[PDB]
Amino acid sequence: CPLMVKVLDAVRGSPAINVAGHVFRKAADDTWEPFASGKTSESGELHGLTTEEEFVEGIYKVEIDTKSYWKALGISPFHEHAEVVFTANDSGPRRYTIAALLSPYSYSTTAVVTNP
Amino acid sequence: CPLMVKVLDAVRGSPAINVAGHVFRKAADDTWEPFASGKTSESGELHGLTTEEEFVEGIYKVEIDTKSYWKALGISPFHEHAEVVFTANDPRRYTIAALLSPYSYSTTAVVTN
Amino acid sequence: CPLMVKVLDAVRGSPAINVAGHVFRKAADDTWEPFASGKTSESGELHGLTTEEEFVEGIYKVEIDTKSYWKALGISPFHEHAEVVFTANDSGPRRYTIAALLSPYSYSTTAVVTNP
Amino acid sequence: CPLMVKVLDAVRGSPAINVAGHVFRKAADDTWEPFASGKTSESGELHGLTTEEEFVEGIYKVEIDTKSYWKALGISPFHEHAEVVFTANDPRRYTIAALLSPYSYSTTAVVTN
Ligand SMILES: [Mg+2]
Ligand SMILES: [Mg+2]
Ligand SMILES: [Mg+2]
Ligand SMILES: [Mg+2]
């Protein structure tokens, strides 16, 4: 799949399981249209969000519901979510892994971009 | 000022200077209304964004224009921007720190009294 | 394998390929004894460093030669290396993934620890 | 002072207070010789570690006792400590920033003139 999301929990040293992720694509009228969504697996991965044919050029937003994740663990975190906004496939189709590392008051996000 | 932003450059090991940051407050219709903005200083800071009286409880978004920063340095970046969305909750000072790399960023909140 | 190392390059958005990694284990006389070493693959992973039987309890150090990595890319980085020091298998055998995210003047390291 | 250390806590969103930090300088026989140490302040900083005259070129190691910090908070940590090893190279001020989580840490150098 050309778009995968991987989420890790920096407090427990584990995948972040059952984290909701929502993908949006910017429309011609500048609004965020829903594109795909899912939940992280026991491996912290969100697989199968899209296909090569559907994942056209565009500006995409991945919104990870980190607040609900921490709250279910008893923690009141700082952020409402972690959101990653990027232009995709501008120079041809690529494969994107969005990795997020979560702490209650901090997160990091990194992209690994590869050419199929 | 109850809200400060500090931006660092992980490639050059320096403050990220002249980066635009925009602050928005969520409105009743769930749209983002402009609240404050500025350009980071020589020390990578956005100062004077708001006041105690203005910075009431609510959901705020800080957008840092990282793409224009990397484009100025001649380095191809991944993100359009770095976004930090949080609820302000009543004394608390909020420092939003952002550490920038072309294909990665981290953001941390230091909330003090 | 109970000990894997994964290294990512935050400048290029890619695995960090051909990075040397050296593992040491603290000896009874408090010195760092060599334990294993290797180089990251095209996937940025260092596989096969040890075995379940050999990876006993102890204090381990993973030293990743980040300086040579950046230098070969034309960059003079801040750090001599990234080194991760931890107690392993204190409550029974575990599987450890040491992930490192590299920038010229910054690195992050995270451990994902799982129970087989 | 040409060398400052700042430590932040990513779980509580605060400076990491009362964290011990030790600075070592590599000796000719490749051993680590103690150079300076302290405990972080209320603001998470180690100040006054060295002077311009003392802080000559060489390889330095900063060891932050993160394990004792997390143990004080009652949180099981992964690392024995956070270690930052670097060559000081001739005006430059070095700020070593460390962002701590129980199973993760990041360190960044801000080098300014
Ligand atoms: Mg085109
Ligand atoms: Mg209230
Ligand atoms: Mg025992
Ligand atoms: Mg010289």
Strand content of chain A: over 45%
- The CA-CA distance between the termini of chain A, in Å, is 11 Å
Main sheet properties of chain A: 5 strands, mixed
Helical fraction of chain A equals: under 10%
The CATH first-level class of chain A comes to Mainly Beta
Count of domains of chain A:
1
Question: Class by helix and strand content of chain A?
Answer: mainly beta
Q: Please report the number of helical segments of chain A.
A: 1
Gyration radius of chain A, rounded? 14 Å
Largest interface: A-B, 20 and 20 residues
Total number of beta strands of chain A: 9
Tell me the series of helices and strands of chain A, N- to C-terminal. EEEEEEHEEE
CATH architecture of chain A: Sandwich
CATH fold-level label of chain A: Immunoglobulin-like
Q: Name the CATH superfamily classification of chain A.
A: Transthyretin/hydroxyisourate hydrolase domain
**What's the overall geometry of chain A?**
globular
The quaternary state of the protein chains shown equals: homotetramer
Bound molecules: magnesium ion
PDB class: transport protein
Keywords: transport of thyroid hormone, transport protein
Assembly: tetrameric
Entry title: Crystal structure of V30G mutated human transthyretin
